[PDB]
Tab-separated table of C-alpha atoms and ligand atoms in Angstrom:
chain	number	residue	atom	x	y	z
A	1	UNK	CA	0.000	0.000	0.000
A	2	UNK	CA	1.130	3.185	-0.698
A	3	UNK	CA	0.054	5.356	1.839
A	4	UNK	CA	-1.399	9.343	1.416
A	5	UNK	CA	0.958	11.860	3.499
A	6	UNK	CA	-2.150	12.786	5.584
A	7	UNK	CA	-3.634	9.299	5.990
A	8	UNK	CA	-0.278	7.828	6.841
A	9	UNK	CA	-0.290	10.963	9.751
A	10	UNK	CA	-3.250	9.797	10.927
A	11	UNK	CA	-2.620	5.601	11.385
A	12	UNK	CA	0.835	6.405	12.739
A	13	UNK	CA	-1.050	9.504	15.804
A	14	UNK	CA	-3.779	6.425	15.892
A	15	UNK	CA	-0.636	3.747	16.926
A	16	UNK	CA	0.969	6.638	19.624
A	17	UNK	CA	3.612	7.547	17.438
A	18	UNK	CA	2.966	11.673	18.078
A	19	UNK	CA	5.314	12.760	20.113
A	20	UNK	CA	6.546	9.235	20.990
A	21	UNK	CA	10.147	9.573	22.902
A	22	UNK	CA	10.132	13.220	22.179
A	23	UNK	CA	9.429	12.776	18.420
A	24	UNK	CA	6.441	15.154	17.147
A	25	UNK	CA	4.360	13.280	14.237
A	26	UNK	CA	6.445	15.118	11.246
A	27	UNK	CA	9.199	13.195	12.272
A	28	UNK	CA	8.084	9.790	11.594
A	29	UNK	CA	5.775	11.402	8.473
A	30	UNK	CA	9.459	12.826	6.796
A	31	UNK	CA	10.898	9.308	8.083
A	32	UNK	CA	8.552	7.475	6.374
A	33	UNK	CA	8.568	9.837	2.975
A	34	UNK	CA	12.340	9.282	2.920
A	35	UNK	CA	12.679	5.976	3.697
A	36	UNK	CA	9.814	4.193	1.851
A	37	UNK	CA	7.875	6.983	0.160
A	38	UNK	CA	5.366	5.940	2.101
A	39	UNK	CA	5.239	2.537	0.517
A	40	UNK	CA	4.645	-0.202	2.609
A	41	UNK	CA	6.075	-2.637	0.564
A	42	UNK	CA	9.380	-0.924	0.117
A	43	UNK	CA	12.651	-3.172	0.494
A	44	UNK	CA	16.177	-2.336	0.041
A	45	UNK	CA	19.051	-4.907	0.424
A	46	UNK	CA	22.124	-3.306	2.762
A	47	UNK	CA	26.190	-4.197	2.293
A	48	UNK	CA	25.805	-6.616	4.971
A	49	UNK	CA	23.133	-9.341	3.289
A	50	UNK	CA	20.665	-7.914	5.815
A	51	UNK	CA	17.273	-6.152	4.198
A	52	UNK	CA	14.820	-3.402	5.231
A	53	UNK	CA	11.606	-3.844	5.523
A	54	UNK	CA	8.716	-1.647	4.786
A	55	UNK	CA	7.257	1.965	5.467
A	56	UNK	CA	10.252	2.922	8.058
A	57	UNK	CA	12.612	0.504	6.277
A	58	UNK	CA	13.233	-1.397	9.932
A	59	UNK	CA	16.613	-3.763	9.211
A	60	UNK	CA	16.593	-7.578	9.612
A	61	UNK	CA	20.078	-7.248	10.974
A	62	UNK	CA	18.300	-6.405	14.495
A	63	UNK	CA	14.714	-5.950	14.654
A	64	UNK	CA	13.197	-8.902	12.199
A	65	UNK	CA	13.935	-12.517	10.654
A	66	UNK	CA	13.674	-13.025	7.221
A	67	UNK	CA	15.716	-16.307	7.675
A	68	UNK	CA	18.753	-15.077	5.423
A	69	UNK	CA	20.340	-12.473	7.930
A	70	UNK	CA	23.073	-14.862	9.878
A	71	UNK	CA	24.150	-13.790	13.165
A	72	UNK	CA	21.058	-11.431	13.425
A	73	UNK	CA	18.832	-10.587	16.232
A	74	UNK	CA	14.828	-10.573	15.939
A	75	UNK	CA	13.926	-7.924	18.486
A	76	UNK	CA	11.104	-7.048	17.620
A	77	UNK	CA	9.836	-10.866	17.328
A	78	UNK	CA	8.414	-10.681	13.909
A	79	UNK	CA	9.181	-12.076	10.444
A	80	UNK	CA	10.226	-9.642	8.251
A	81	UNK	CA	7.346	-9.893	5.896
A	82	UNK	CA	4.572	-8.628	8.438
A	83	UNK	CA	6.634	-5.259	8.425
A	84	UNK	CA	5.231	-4.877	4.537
A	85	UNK	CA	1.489	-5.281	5.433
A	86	UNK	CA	-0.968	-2.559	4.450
A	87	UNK	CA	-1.795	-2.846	8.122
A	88	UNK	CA	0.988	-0.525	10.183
A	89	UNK	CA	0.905	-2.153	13.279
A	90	UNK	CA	3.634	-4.308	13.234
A	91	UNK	CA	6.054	-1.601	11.698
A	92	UNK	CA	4.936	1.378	14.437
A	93	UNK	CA	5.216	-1.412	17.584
A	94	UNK	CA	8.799	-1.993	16.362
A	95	UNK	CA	9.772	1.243	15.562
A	96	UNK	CA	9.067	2.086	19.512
A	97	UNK	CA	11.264	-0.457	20.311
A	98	UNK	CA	13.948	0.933	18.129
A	99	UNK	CA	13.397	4.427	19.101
A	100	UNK	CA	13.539	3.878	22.544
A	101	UNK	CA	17.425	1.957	22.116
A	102	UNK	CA	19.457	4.745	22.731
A	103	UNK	CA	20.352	6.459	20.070
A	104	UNK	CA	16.382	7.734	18.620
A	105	UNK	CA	15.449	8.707	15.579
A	106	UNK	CA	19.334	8.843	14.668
A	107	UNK	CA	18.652	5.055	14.016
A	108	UNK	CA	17.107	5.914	10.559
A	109	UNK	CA	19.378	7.526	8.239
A	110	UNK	CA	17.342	8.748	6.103
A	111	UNK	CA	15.346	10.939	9.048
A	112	UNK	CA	19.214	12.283	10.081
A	113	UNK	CA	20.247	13.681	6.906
A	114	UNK	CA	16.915	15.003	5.936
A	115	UNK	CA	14.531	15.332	8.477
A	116	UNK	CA	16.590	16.362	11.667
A	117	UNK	CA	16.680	20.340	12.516
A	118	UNK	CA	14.384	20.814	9.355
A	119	UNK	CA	10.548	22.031	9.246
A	120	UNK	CA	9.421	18.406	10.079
A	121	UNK	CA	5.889	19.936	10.960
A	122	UNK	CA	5.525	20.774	7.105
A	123	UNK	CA	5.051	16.945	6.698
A	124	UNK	CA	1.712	17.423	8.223
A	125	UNK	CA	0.033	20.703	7.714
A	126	UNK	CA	-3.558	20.885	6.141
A	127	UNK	CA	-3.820	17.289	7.546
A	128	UNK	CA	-6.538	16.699	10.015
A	129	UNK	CA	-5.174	15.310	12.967
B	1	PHN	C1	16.292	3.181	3.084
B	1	PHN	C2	16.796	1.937	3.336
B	1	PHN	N1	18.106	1.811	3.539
B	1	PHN	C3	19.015	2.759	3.428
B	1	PHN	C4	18.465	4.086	3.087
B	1	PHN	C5	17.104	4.286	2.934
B	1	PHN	C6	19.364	5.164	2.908
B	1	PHN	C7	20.726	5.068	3.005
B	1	PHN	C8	21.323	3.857	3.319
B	1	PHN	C9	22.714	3.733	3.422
B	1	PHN	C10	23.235	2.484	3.688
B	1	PHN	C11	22.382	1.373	3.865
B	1	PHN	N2	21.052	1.460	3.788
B	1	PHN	C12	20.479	2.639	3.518
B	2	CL	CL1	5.548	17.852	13.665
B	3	CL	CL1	19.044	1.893	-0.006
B	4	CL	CL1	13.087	-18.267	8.711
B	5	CL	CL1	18.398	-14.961	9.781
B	6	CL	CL1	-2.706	1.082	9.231
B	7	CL	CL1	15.978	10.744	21.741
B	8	NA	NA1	17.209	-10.933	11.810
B	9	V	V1	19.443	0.147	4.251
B	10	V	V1	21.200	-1.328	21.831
B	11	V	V1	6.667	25.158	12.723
B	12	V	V1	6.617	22.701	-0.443
């Protein structure tokens, strides 16, 4: 599914992600844009073998199995594959286990070098919230 900028604001306030750790909603909304572009079923493969999975692109090196990671953790006790469901559940309960690991929303590379210290709250005017 490829998710509406407003509509994806809306399931990820719905899941607790406003404000979650800190984070204000345009956070996760530019995370999302740059990471998946707000496709659900977005993968990329990384240097390592591991993948990323989904509409926050969370890696199988830590968080997921996909059964062709070795060495990896599953943190977040999923398979990899329920991170790509239309259904954002499984990717926002992760996510708040990843955000809460010590480093935050510096975890996603894509919300570091475009997202942080920017307008993030542009990624959700005119939406109602
Ligand atoms: C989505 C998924 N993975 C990535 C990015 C965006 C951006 C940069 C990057 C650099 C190294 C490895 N993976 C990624
Ligand atoms: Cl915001
Ligand atoms: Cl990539
Ligand atoms: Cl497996
Ligand atoms: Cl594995
Ligand atoms: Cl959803
Ligand atoms: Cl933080
Ligand atoms: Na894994
Ligand atoms: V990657
Ligand atoms: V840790
Ligand atoms: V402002
Ligand atoms: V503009």
């Amino acid at each position: 599914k490829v998710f509406g900028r407003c509509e994806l604001a809306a399931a990820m306030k719905r899941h607790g992600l406003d404000n979650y750790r800190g984070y204000s909603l345009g956070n996760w909304v530019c995370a999302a844009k740059f990471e998946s572009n707000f496709n659900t079923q977005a993968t990329n493969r990384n240097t390592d073998g591991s993948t990323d999975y989904g509409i926050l692109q969370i890696n199988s090196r830590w968080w997921c199995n996909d059964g062709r990671t070795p060495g990896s953790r599953n943190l977040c006790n999923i398979p990899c594959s329920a991170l790509l469901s239309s259904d954002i559940t499984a990717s926002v309960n992760c996510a708040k286990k990843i955000v809460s690991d010590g480093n935050g929303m510096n975890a996603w590379v894509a919300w570091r070098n475009r997202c942080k210290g920017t307008d993030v709250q542009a990624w959700i005017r005119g939406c109602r919230l």
